[PDB]
Structures are given as C-alpha cells and as structure tokens.
C-alpha cells in the first residue's frame, strides 16, 4: 500500500523530454524525479495513509456548539444540522463537492453552573436528551413539549459524567451524496435559497436536560463533534482561502491568494 518507489535513473540524452510537458493539455505530468533528474533507487516505504479521505475525515471535529440552560427557547439548543456551522470541519468537508459519509456524531456536553448570587444547591447528575428531528418532523417549542417523546426520533439520553454520547448516523441524504457545494436554488424558478442550504437539509438536533429543573441556573454546552466514516468523496475542491462568514451560504469576504512576500525573489533565510 506504500507509494511508488523512486526508480533508479542515470544520465540521459534522448528525445523523450520527460520534463517537457504541456499544461495546455490539462493533464498534470506523471513525471518522477528519476525522469527529470538522476536519482538513486529509493524504496519508498512511505504510504499515503492518514491522507485517505476516510482517514482525513476520521479526525472528529466540532460542528455545533451551543449553550442550553436549566431553569422559553434558551432551555434547549436547536441545531439546523449542517457541517458548515464550524469552519474547522466545514473546510475539510468543502474539499469535496459530494461526500457519501456515514457521519458519527459524538456529543460532548459539559455543565457550566452559571455564576449567580446563590450557587450553594447541588443538583444531581444531569441527564441530556439529544433528540434528532428528521426534516419535516415535529419541532419542539418547549423543553417539556410532546415532541420530546421519542416515539420515532432517535435520542441518546446521555447522562453527565459518563463516556461522551456517540450515535453513528447512516447516509441520510435524499440524493446519492451529501452535496457540500450546491450551486442551485431551492425552487425551480431559480428563486429562493441558494447554496448547500437547499439540498443539505438533514433535519434538526434539539438538545435538552432530561432533568425537569434545577435550583440554580445551569447552562450546559452541547459540543457536537462530527466524525465522517465510510466517506465517498466524489468531486474534489480547493480549501476556501477566505474566512467563512455565513453558515448557510458560501458568501465570503475577499482574501489574498497567499501570504504576500516582499518580492517575487524574496526567499526568507
């Protein structure tokens, strides 16, 4: 599974011109260092492991951080489920237009115990219900609404102090891939929502405290970490140089192509 070994080369004066190619063809030259220059026989035990899209997405990264409190809509956290909320994994997922990945969510929830005048009352271990409402499903409006009855909606019901909750999610896109980039309008009139927001509507994630109330306000932070696995990247894209501005669109502020250097001949050190 290792990369191709550098074949031994020698002096050459021929008509092969391996270095001389044409980018006009659009084909990146398949040349090796043995072609242009003279190289020794180096057996490359180096392997393109951890560079696989499966391994690259294997690193779990946050996609959703929100603060929901105990003792309105601030007692539970609502997440329009998209990878684009957090820039760290968004740019990874935006390296490819289509990724057919089974996403492994690992919720990390930490209670904060908000600083108040009175904080001398100790609440028992806080259980957390991370319910997933599929798109078009019943969206709860209160922390005790009927939607929290998980007849069909999956829910971990994670309790604090245990191992972080983790529920692997299959490939749920209506299409055959998750369109991270989708230059398309929601409506056929070409008017509406432009971007990944249209196709990447995978429901919502409502996070609440299973505990009814606490003597003092406790604002637990739900840190959702998305680990893509069984990924099928299908159309590669460059990383977005510009910083992410909107989580529902690719809208960006202009950014330099690279870090500017003093001169075209400016080589530090």
């Amino acid at each position: 599974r290792t990369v191709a070994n550098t074949q031994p080369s020698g002096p050459s004066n021929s008509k092969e011109i391996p270095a001389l190619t044409a980018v006009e063809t659009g084909h990146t030259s398949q040349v090796d260092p043995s072609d242009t220059l003279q190289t020794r026989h180096v057996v490359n035990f180096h392997s393109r492991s951890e560079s696989t899209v499966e391994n690259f997405m294997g690193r779990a990264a946050c996609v959703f951080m929100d603060q929901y409190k105990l003792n309105s809509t601030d007692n539970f956290a609502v997440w329009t489920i998209n990878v684009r909320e957090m820039a760290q994994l968004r740019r990874k997922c935006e390296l490819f237009t289509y990724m057919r990945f089974d996403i492994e969510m690992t919720m990390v929830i930490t209670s904060c115990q908000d600083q108040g005048t009175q904080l001398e009352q100790d609440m028992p271990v806080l259980t957390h219900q991370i319910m997933y409402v599929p798109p078009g499903g019943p969206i709860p409006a209160k922390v005790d609404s009927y939607e929290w009855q998980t007849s069909t909606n999956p829910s971990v019901f994670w309790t604090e102090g245990n191992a972080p909750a983790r529920m692997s999610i299959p490939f749920i896109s209506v299409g055959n891939a998750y369109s991270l980039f989708y230059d398309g309008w929601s409506h056929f009139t070409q008017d509406g929502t432009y971007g990944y927001t249209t196709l990447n509507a995978m429901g919502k994630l409502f996070v609440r405290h299973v505990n009814k109330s606490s003597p003092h306000q406790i604002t637990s932070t739900i840190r959702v970490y998305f680990k893509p696995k069984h990924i099928k990247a299908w159309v590669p894209r460059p990383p977005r140089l510009c910083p992410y501005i909107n989580k529902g669109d690719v809208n960006f502020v202009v950014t330099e192509v690279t870090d500017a250097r003093k001169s075209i001949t400016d080589t530090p050190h």
């Binding site: 599974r1 092969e16 011109i17 391996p18 001389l20 190619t21 044409a22 006009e24 063809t25 659009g26 084909h27 990146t28 030259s29 398949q30 040349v31 072609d35 392997s47 393109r48 492991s49 696989t52 499966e54 391994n55 997405m57 294997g58 089974d102 492994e104 692997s168 999610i169 299959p170 490939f171 680990k227 696995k229 069984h230 590669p236």
Partner: protein, 41 residues
C-alpha cells in the same frame, strides 16, 4: 479487531485500512493517453 458488533453497516469502525487511490481521475483526465516520455503537443 475487525469484528462488527452492530448490525447496521454505518454503525461500524471507519475503513482506515483502505488505501485505494486513483490519481488518474485528476492528474491524467485526458482522453488520449499521454506518456511523459513523449512530447505532449
């Protein structure tokens, strides 16, 4: 090891031991085969 303890296929470990690679999709997408040892024209 490689034993899958969950019935659902998605509920399995990532396929981190698969190192399949076909750079020819991107590096060599031309219809006519281009050999480095000949002029590209």
């Amino acid at each position: 090891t490689n034993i899958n303890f969950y019935k659902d296929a998605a509920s399995s470990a990532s396929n981190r031991q698969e190192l399949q690679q076909d750079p020819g999709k991107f590096t060599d997408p031309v219809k006519d085969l281009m050999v480095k040892t000949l002029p590209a024209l």
